[PDB]
């Protein structure tokens, strides 16, 4: 049957890697995040790659106000990346920013992995990170990122070019957002 947006965006994420285009994106920047989002969602959402002007919330959590989101992003992208701790802190702030109307989770996990790969030569082996544990670590992270740090640290891999880790990790990442 016709592909859904989630199904086609999953195909687009696989192609981002298969084509090599993944390694031609800026790492750790707002623009690089926009490039990922545009790759995943171009042709699917009208706002692919575009910083939102509206507010958004999920449960009782409101993401950064659109009113100062651009300003927040400039500071976020300048955060340092030389240790695991620093990289997770930068990711936590980019998650709080949540700069698109949709597609933040999936795009920003790819963004995180590129920062880890550049600076540590590791990525997250997402297939082994349970949805429940991931979502509760993320819910705690604005106040206390320790649970998230340890969860992700225990699931790092140095096998950053392995197809199965990459493709199963895309699958898992999309499953965090409800798609299987």
Per the annotation, binding residues are 58, 95-98, 103-109, 131-134, 177
From the CB of 47, what's the least distance to Cl ion, in Å?
13
Distance (Å, whole) CA 117 – CA 111: 10
Cα–Cα distance for residue pair 33/109, rounded to 1 Å: 10
Nearest distance, CB of residue 139 and Cl ion, angstroms = 15
Counting contacts by CB under 5 A, is residue 81 touching Cl ion?
no
The residue whose Cβ lies closest to Cl ion is 105
* 94 touches Cl ion (CB under 5 A): no
Among 25, 89, 123, 129, contact with Cl ion (rule: CB under 5 A): 89
CB closer to Cl ion, 17 vs 63:
63
Number of residues located near Cl ion, criterion CB under 5 A: 6
Rounded Cα gap, residues 40 and 5, in angstroms: 10
With a CB cutoff of 8 Å and minimum separation 6, the contacts of 158 are 121, 122
Q: Is 58 helix (H, G, I), strand (E, B) or coil?
A: strand
Which residues of the chain form beta strands (DSSP E)? 57-58, 61-62, 123-124, 156-157
Binding-site positions for ATP: 58, 95-98, 103-109, 131-134, 177
Q: Which residues contact Cl ion (rule: CB under 5 A)?
A: 64, 89, 103, 105-106, 177
């Amino acid at each position: 049957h016709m592909k859904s947006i989630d199904e086609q965006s999953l195909h687009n994420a696989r192609r981002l890697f298969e084509s090599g285009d993944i390694d031609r994106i800026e790492v750790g920047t707002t623009a690089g995040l926009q490039q990922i989002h545009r790759y995943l969602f171009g042709g699917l959402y009208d706002f692919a790659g575009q910083i939102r002007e509206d507010n958004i919330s999920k449960g009782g959590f409101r993401f950064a106000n659109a009113m100062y989101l651009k300003e927040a992003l400039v500071k976020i992208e300048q955060m340092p990346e030389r240790t695991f701790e620093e990289i997770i802190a930068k990711y936590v702030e980019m998650n709080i920013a949540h700069p698109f109307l949709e597609g933040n989770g999936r795009s920003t996990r790819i963004w995180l992995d590129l920062v880890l790969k550049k600076n540590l030569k590791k990525v997250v082996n997402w297939q082994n990170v349970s949805k429940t544990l991931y979502l509760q670590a993320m819910e705690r992270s604005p106040v206390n990122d320790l649970r998230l740090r340890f969860l992700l640290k225990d699931n790092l891999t140095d096998d950053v070019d392995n197809r199965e880790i990459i493709f199963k990790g895309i699958e898992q990442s999309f499953y965090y957002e409800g798609y299987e």
